[PDB]
Design a binder for these strands. Structure first.
Ligand SMILES: [Zn+2]
Lengths: 35, 64, 89, 76, 90, 88, 76, 74
DNA sequence: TGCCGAGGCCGCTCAATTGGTCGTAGACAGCTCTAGCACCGCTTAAACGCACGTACGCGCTGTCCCCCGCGTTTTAACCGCCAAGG
DNA sequence: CCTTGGCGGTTAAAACGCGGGGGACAGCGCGTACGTGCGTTTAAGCGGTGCTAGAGCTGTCTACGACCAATTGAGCGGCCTCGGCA
């Protein structure tokens, strides 16, 4: 997850990050929406 | 360990394709189909050799 | 009208909420001034005690622990919060 | 299961409440009181979610379900 | 004595007293019994836990009063069976 | 919504004491609750008398009904001495 | 006065409540509970009458005052 | 009704005088107040009874009433 | 000695002001309802004393189930290893 | 040479047996003040006309504030200038 706060703000936006996968010439990202 | 697999099968009710998820519990021989859309659930027995196409086949016969 | 009435809440935004809440078909001329005055009194009575308790305890800011300790103490307004629960999370 | 509400968590809660010594037949009762409280609040939270055509029970559905019991919750 | 100590401590603090993970599992289980795979905002579960713990704590206050009324220091089933009845819960 | 005015009254009542960010959401849910309770009660009042306009008199009665005792007295004195200062 | 709430009328209420035996100090404690209940309901009934610009407390003002305590009264 | 209705009316008018003056009452208003008051007292006595029985006390005492009222949130 | 912090100027989006409908809200009259407040006759209901009884409470006993501490140990939940494939 | 299928290794604490030692549950004794059914006498309670009018019920009339439609002014965010602490 990209932290909005230091582990104090680090400039983060708080969003969780996706697991990006390659499928030929296309890239797919799977985000885990907030078990 | 359970297997959570996405499939490219069409739900027999809501007709959304690529939205059926198959959960195969081999420790208890219980397979579970789930939609991701309308989320209808269907349970059926599985062996050790079964695959998402085996329970999805049993779901087609359970309707007809 | 807020400075003219020498108040701190906007009679306007609250009036807009009343229009959006559709609590009636038509408001009065001085009904939102009374409601903002009354609301303003309740906020300046709760935060007056939170600011009295932050300096009585010695705290600098106002935490939700200060709100939970005040509103369930202070029998003046503890009756308003008989059935409330500040989450503290 | 309801067994996740353990013995020392009910004991801790009792300590917060002001209980000194606690008899054994109180955890099950609490487990049975807590389950009734959740079955009364989650029913209304699921009713607000099904009314809002959602699938995710937000925290405002829980605040509305607690508001329908005279248990207003501030901070959400 | 240690009991008293804990009461002085817990009443002083406001952190949740039930373990998060376990509570999340209980809520999702119960909810699963009404509607299958219901997704939850984290704040929804947090709301449920705050509400549940406040409820249980208050219940334990009343229960304590019921035990003390009967000249007892230990809370039992007859206490809750009384507190909840007078509350109109049962 | 109402969070910008809670800090503005706090600058008058305690210009030295600050407030947190969760306590601002608590005071904002408190204000939106006592607003949607007073307006709701007032709406009930305007229906029981078959009126159509919420005047300041249905707000003064909903304050007398909702707030118990001295908070209602003080609540009705501040609204009256704000409407009179408004009309002048 | 509150003394019109006679000893045998509280005794009758207690009997209607299922009480077998009554101590000699319930009588002044029940009048102090009844006076608080009337001071809480009549305040709201007088508030509805002063809001309705009347001078006669009707029975619907009493029904509304009991409705504001979770004591809905049918038949008026 | 178990209370002399007239006494409930007197007491009522007295208490009411302390809130608003020169008040008049419909007879049905007083009757409503009496039904409500007596229902309330009866229920309270049920709960009090339960408290007494809880404390090996089937016979209500002021202590029992106070416990009942405290748990009711009164 | 000099650039990022703060106040000012130019755009954005929503709030404030004005004019025509428009049915619903306020006035007002005719008129009957049940609440108005004063007196009878009778009666169900209420004020005050009794007394031996059942309930309410204090004190001592049994044994007994929660009280406090320690140790790994296990689910649940976070971080690294077996040896098959493509 | 690299990344998943199931598997040890990774913690805060409780799954608490169980060793120790005592607070306190429920039955049992005694023991006293209070306590209601029955008894008296009563002062208010239930039901009937007689009288008198307040304002609800329902009717049509006259009426002033909001709806949605074109103007247009102030608060706020993105450029852009000014200025003393390091
Ligand atoms: Zn489907």
């Amino acid at each position: 997850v990209c932290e909005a706060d230091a582990p104090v703000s680090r400039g983060g936006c708080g969003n969780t990050q996706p697991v990006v996968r390659k499928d030929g010439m296309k890239l797919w990202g799977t985000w885990k929406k907030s078990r | 360990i359970k297997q959570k697999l996405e499939t490219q099968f069409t739900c027999l009710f809501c007709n959304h394709d690529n939205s059926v998820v198959c959960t195969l519990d081999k420790k208890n021989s219980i397979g579970l189909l789930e939609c991701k859309k309308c989320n209808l659930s269907f349970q059926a027995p599985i062996n050790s050799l079964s695959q998402p196409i085996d329970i999805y086949s049993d779901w087609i016969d359970a309707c007809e | 009208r807020t400075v003219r009435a020498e108040l701190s809440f906007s009679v306007s935004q609250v009036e807009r909420s009343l229009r959006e809440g559709h609590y009636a078909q038509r408001l009065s001329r001085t009904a939102p001034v009374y409601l903002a005055a009354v609301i303003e009194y309740l906020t300046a009575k709760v935060l007056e005690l939170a600011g009295n308790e932050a300096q009585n305890s010695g705290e600098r800011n106002i935490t939700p622990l200060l709100l939970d300790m005040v509103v369930h103490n202070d029998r003046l307004l503890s009756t308003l919060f008989n059935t409330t629960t500040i989450s503290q999370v | 299961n309801i067994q996740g509400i353990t013995k020392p968590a009910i004991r801790r809660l009792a300590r917060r409440g002001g209980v000194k010594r606690i008899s054994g037949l109180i955890y099950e009762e609490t487990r049975g009181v807590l389950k009734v409280f959740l079955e009364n609040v989650i029913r209304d939270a699921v009713t607000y979610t099904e009314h809002a055509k959602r699938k995710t029970v937000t925290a405002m559905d829980v605040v509305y379900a607690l508001k329908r019991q005279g248990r207003t919750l501030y901070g959400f | 004595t240690v009991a008293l100590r804990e009461i002085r401590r817990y009443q002083k603090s406001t952190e949740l007293l039930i373990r998060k993970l376990p509570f999340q599992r209980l809520v999702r289980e119960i909810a699963q019994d009404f509607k299958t795979d219901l997704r939850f905002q984290s704040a929804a579960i947090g709301a449920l836990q705050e509400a549940s713990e406040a409820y249980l704590v208050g219940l334990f206050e009343d229960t304590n009063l019921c035990a003390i009324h009967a000249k007892r220091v230990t809370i039992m089933p007859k206490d809750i069976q009384l507190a909840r009845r007078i509350r109109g819960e049962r | 919504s109402y969070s910008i005015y809670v800090y503005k009254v706090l600058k008058q009542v305690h210009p030295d004491t600050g407030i947190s960010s969760k306590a601002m959401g608590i005071m904002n849910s408190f204000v939106n609750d006592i607003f949607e309770r007073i307006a709701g009660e007032a709406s009930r009042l305007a229906h029981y008398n078959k009126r159509s306009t919420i005047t300041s008199r249905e707000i003064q009665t909903a304050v007398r009904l909702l707030l118990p005792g001295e908070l209602a007295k003080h609540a009705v004195s501040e609204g009256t001495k704000a409407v009179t200062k408004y009309t002048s």
